[PDB]
């Protein structure tokens, strides 16, 4: 029961708008944002410690959940022991602590879901697991974006202001993951569906690619796997996966349409649950794909919607909010 955690457990988070972040693209500005990072990170960690303290006693007593709760406390202690930033030199000392804590250990997400699974006999709230894991995933993504962005503001990459790409092409980032997915699918079945990309193929806009690097390969794997399992009798003649890009002033829509047989009526109300799967930080398998991708899409101001045509295929709509 530590009092420093209690002091910031209810303190509202301060999130800089990506628009404001793009404007800071800078010695006097890096000092101001570095001071902000130092003071924000313990508040984000204390919110998650408060989450562990609020679990029902029997669940919070799981040795895996308890071990993860201790990891959060130890991280809070390391981030608060560091003295307040006064100059550019103090700002640069804090970046190095941030890097060592970001690349730290365990694979917390994996341990948490394991602990929650071991405690399922004591879980009465049908939504407790889904809510705890959504909050854990979006909070850790928020922490990652906060820390990785500030570190990247010191480095100079073309077309980037920190982790924000100023000229992101959805077609290029989709193509990058299509090639990765097709190689894995080809190795497994001896073939892979071809992926066509249509719509606003020349669209380019400011966006943060990091969450797409989890979402796109997962959805592509889902569509390609469903197509192959659906056409096992003709494995060398399978229908294409068709991706459409729609770009407007409000959002970017990526529709991924397959002919993989659809998501059955009996599984539809389970596909968005953690651990639900029909296959034989956040993980890519074990039923994490869809709930993680949806939590990420909604955290970023968009959504992940599914339309199942049982017997034919599925259309998956990823919508993401524009920055300006
Ligand atoms: C209409 C504005 C849409 C902007 C948006 O996507 N929003 C969430 C968000 C904000 C900030 C980040 C972020 C980006 C880079 C580096 C760190 C952070 C961050 N994340 N957590 N702390 N810092 C990510 C998502 C909204 C907001 O909050 O402005 C909400 C209202 C939908
Ligand atoms: C300055 C870091 C403060 C936060 C911190 O120290 N930690 C959370 C954390 C760590 C790593 C990531 C991360 C980094 C790279 C790639 C993926 C992820 C990730 N991981 N999950 N989603 N994204 C995010 C958050 C602890 C830990 O987890 O080590 C805990 C014990 C407080
Ligand atoms: N495009 C799709 N077509 C058919 N079934 C799908 C599709 N996308 C997802 N599914 C179903 O939803 C389940 C859960 O998906 P997901 O959360 O990504 O986990 P995983 O990929 O680890 O199985 C899949 O195992 C599969 O049964």
């Amino acid at each position: 029961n530590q009092s420093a955690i209690d002091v910031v457990a209810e303190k509202p988070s301060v999130r800089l708008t990506p628009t404001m972040m793009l404007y800071s693209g800078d010695g006097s500005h890096l000092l101001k944002s570095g001071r902000y990072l130092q003071q924000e990170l313990p508040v984000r960690i204390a919110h998650r410690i408060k989450g562990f303290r609020s679990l029902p006693f029997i669940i919070g007593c799981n040795p895996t959940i308890l071990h993860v709760h201790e990891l959060y406390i130890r991280a809070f202690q390391k981030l608060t022991d560091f003295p307040p930033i006064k100059d550019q030199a103090d700002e640069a000392q804090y970046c190095q602590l941030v890097r060592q804590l970001l690349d730290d250990h365990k694979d917390v997400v994996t341990l948490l879901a394991e602990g929650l699974r071991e405690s399922r006999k004591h879980i009465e709230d049908e939504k407790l697991v889904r809510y705890f894991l959504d909050k854990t995933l979006t909070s850790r993504l928020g922490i990652r974006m906060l820390a990785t962005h500030h570190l990247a503001l010191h480095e100079d990459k073309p077309d980037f202001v920190g982790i924000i790409c100023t000229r992101l092409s959805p077609k290029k980032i989709i193509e990058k993951w299509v090639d990765f997915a097709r190689r894995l699918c080809e190795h497994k079945y001896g073939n892979a569906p071809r992926v066509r990309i249509n719509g606003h193929v020349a669209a380019r806009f400011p966006f943060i690619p990091m969450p797409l690097d989890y979402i796109l390969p997962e959805l592509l794997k889902n569509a390609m796997r469903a197509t192959m399992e659906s056409h096992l009798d003709t494995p060398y003649n399978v229908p294409d996966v068709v991706i459409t890009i729609a770009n407007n002033d409000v959002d970017l829509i990526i529709r991924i349409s397959d002919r993989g047989g659809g998501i059955a009526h009996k599984d539809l109300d389970r596909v968005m649950d953690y651990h639900f799967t029909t296959a034989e930080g956040p993980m890519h398998g074990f039923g994490f794909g869809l709930p993680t991708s949806r939590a990420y899409a909604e955290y970023l101001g968009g959504s992940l919607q599914l339309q199942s045509l049982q017997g034919i295929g599925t259309d998956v709509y990823l919508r993401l909010r524009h920055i300006d």
Side-chain angles (χ1 to χ4, degrees), residues 1-23 25-279 281-324:
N1 270 74
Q2 257 182 328
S3 56
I5 295 147
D6 294 347
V7 167
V8 282
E10 320 297 328
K11 177 168 164 62
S13 303
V14 6
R15 229 167 302 259
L16 271 297
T17 333
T19 315
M20 306 165 152
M21 307 183 74
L22 271 179
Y23 215 94
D26 48 356
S28 196
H29 293 36
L30 249 47
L31 219 193
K32 192 232 172 190
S33 74
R35 280 195 182 97
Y36 159 66
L37 185 61
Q38 173 175 74
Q39 298 155 220
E40 194 56 26
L41 248 23
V43 176
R44 300 305 179 88
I45 288 176
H47 289 172
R48 292 292 70 68
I49 295 174
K50 174 190 169 73
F52 291 110
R53 294 165 166 195
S54 307
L55 282 172
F57 176 75
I58 197 176
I59 303 170
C61 274
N62 173 269
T64 310
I65 293 168
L66 241 199
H67 174 258
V68 166
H69 187 175
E70 301 187 350
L71 294 174
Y72 273 72
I73 292 167
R74 287 185 88 253
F76 182 89
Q77 289 160 337
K78 295 171 184 181
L79 290 173
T80 56
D81 289 353
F82 209 82
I85 294 173
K86 297 291 287 193
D87 47 43
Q88 284 241 267
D90 282 343
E91 194 263 332
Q93 204 173 288
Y94 186 74
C95 295
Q96 320 301 140
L97 172 68
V98 159
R99 309 187 217 257
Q100 305 184 4
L101 290 177
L102 274 173
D103 201 5
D104 222 353
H105 63 181
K106 306 301 186 236
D107 289 25
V108 161
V109 179
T110 294
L111 290 175
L112 269 194
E114 246 312 299
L116 287 173
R117 177 183 155 274
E118 297 178 4
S119 315
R120 100 213 99 172
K121 55 189 152 54
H122 304 298
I123 293 176
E124 54 292 294
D125 195 352
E126 190 86 3
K127 306 171 297 153
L128 187 118
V129 174
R130 188 159 50 79
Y131 288 24
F132 193 81
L133 292 177
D134 286 347
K135 239 293 154 160
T136 306
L137 294 174
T138 61
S139 310
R140 291 176 63 87
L141 172 64
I143 287 172
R144 184 182 174 198
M145 294 192 293
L146 237 180
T148 304
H149 179 78
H150 181 78
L151 294 177
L153 284 178
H154 288 268
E155 285 66 79
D156 187 35
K157 292 218 298 182
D159 292 0
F160 275 85
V161 169
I163 63 167
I164 305 165
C165 179
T166 57
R167 291 185 63 250
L168 180 71
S169 163
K171 174 182 190 280
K172 283 297 179 150
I173 194 170
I174 290 164
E175 282 174 342
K176 171 224 275 177
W177 290 112
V178 160
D179 296 6
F180 170 94
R182 295 199 80 244
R183 278 192 299 166
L184 297 180
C185 187
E186 271 166 15
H187 178 253
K188 193 178 179 172
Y189 306 97
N191 190 40
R194 151 187 175 237
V195 178
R196 303 208 318 276
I197 310 173
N198 61 37
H200 294 149
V201 301
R204 293 197 89 111
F205 41 81
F207 202 72
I208 305 173
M210 157 189 52
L212 302 182
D213 289 335
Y214 177 91
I215 299 165
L216 301 174
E218 185 64 36
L219 300 184
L220 289 172
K221 178 195 61 191
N222 287 354
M224 288 188 193
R225 178 183 58 209
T227 304
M228 297 312 294
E229 300 296 337
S230 195
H231 300 263
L232 277 180
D233 63 301
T234 60
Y236 310 138
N237 191 27
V238 300
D240 294 356
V241 167
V242 185
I243 307 185
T244 306
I245 304 173
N247 190 35
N248 57 80
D249 294 359
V250 174
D251 64 351
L252 156 75
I253 310 103
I254 293 153
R255 178 187 57 201
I256 302 175
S257 304
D258 66 61
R259 291 292 177 112
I263 298 170
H265 276 102
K266 71 187 248 187
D267 301 324
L268 206 45
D269 302 294
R270 279 179 302 175
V271 293
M272 284 284 178
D273 293 337
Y274 289 93
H275 303 108
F276 180 81
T277 180
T278 59
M283 304 91 84
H284 265 292
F286 311 97
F288 268 68
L290 289 173
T292 305
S293 297
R294 174 174 270 183
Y296 274 24
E298 287 179 4
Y299 178 70
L300 298 172
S303 60
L304 184 62
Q305 293 170 13
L306 280 73
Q307 286 287 161
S308 177
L309 292 89
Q310 294 87 355
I312 291 294
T314 306
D315 298 322
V316 178
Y317 301 80
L318 171 60
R319 284 180 175 89
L320 291 168
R321 188 154 196 87
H322 276 304
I323 289 168
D324 201 31

